[PDB]
Design a binder for this molecule. Structure first.
Ligand SMILES: Nc1ncnc2c1ncn2[C@@H]1O[C@H](COP(=O)(O)OP(=O)(O)OP(=O)(O)O)[C@@H](O)[C@H]1O
Ligand SMILES: [Zn+2]
Lengths: 150, 151
């Protein structure tokens, strides 16, 4: 039944990685730091229905901050307040987890610690250039939850 | 921004700043107690403001993902030995625009030159930052003959 799916899902938390449950970067809904919060921008953010919205600067693979929708609360559309400003006010923690990370660990890291969101990155070892980190996309609590209720 | 401490010598490997972040950058570097900065990649900003704050900058670039030439290595060891004697307890900063390749290698050379084993050193480095070495660089540090130039 459903219980048996939960049980199986729970045992396979050791095996599975965050790379398996994650949302690819291409499918991520994000926002530029250079964005201005006006009627249109705020409305679009709200239209997406995402509580947590990654903020990138320049290339999308570069994520410099995180914007919750509750940050848009008393912000006025007619004021045209820059996004940099708001992010300066609240400044929500941004976690980066590696792709080889097990779901067990990721779950524990969500429980302790406030944040329900994490960024997936991997080490690029291709030769001969300097090894660098590569952002693949995001992984949230609802992701690791979904794996374990099938 | 990662701190490395061994014996009397202390190093700090940082991200590469932008031109505007200098205001917030100096604030960081003054906190760790840096004196000298070693730029091993490319020049991304005006060094004028930086040296104006009393922080000397050194540009010793070399090929991406490749071990540093003998020249750079000797100058590096000399720089370490001299600067740590000149002002005991200070710090030397290395950085690059890419990250994890060229900058930690110099630190590793100095580290194994200070009486640390190759394995124990690379482990100490990678523990603070995962990855941090490519194919070519691993070999360079593996087979590096220490001169014990620090003493
Ligand atoms: N901003 C976003 N852009 C793209 N994908 C997202 C975004 N937020 C979450 N996801 C993905 O959507 C799925 C559901 O995520 P989640 O439920 O956490 O979204 P949410 O509604 O913003 O937050 P909450 O869980 O608190 O309701 C997951 O696969 C997650 O990776
Ligand atoms: Zn949800």
């Amino acid at each position: 039944m459903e219980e048996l799916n939960i049980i199986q899902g729970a045992l396979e938390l050791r095996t599975k990685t965050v790379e398996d449950v994650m949302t690819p970067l291409r499918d991520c809904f994000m926002i530029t730091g250079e964005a201005i919060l006006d009627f249109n921008t705020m409305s679009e953010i709200m239209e997406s229905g995402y509580t947590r919205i990654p903020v990138f600067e320049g290339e999308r693979s570069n994520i410099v901050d995180l914007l919750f929708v509750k940050d848009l609360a008393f912000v006025d559309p007619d004021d045209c307040t820059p996004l940099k400003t708001i992010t300066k006010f609240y400044n929500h923690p941004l976690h980066f987890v590696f792709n080889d990370t097990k779901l067990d660990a990721m779950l524990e890291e969500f429980k302790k610690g406030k944040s329900h969101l994490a960024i997936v990155q991997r080490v690029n070892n291709e030769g001969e250039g300097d090894p660098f980190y590569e952002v693949l996309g995001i992984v949230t609590l609802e992701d690791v939850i979904e794996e374990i209720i099938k | 921004p990662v701190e490395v401490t061994y014996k009397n010598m202390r190093f700090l490997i940082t991200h590469n700043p932008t031109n505007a972040t200098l205001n917030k950058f100096i604030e960081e570097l003054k906190k760790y107690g840096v004196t000298t900065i070693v730029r091993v990649c490319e020049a991304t900003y005006d060094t004028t403001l930086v040296e104006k704050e009393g922080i000397h900058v050194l540009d010793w670039p070399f090929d991406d993902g490749a071990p540093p030439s003998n020249q750079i290595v000797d100058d590096w060891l000399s720089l370490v030995k001299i600067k740590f004697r000149e002002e005991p307890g200070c710090c030397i900063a290395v950085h690059c625009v890419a990250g994890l390749g060229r900058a930690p290698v110099l630190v590793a050379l100095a580290l194994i030159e200070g009486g640390m084993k190759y394995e124990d050193a690379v482990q100490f480095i990678r523990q603070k930052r995962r990855g941090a070495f490519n194919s070519k660089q691993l070999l360079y540090l593996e087979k590096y003959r220490p001169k014990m130039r620090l003493r």
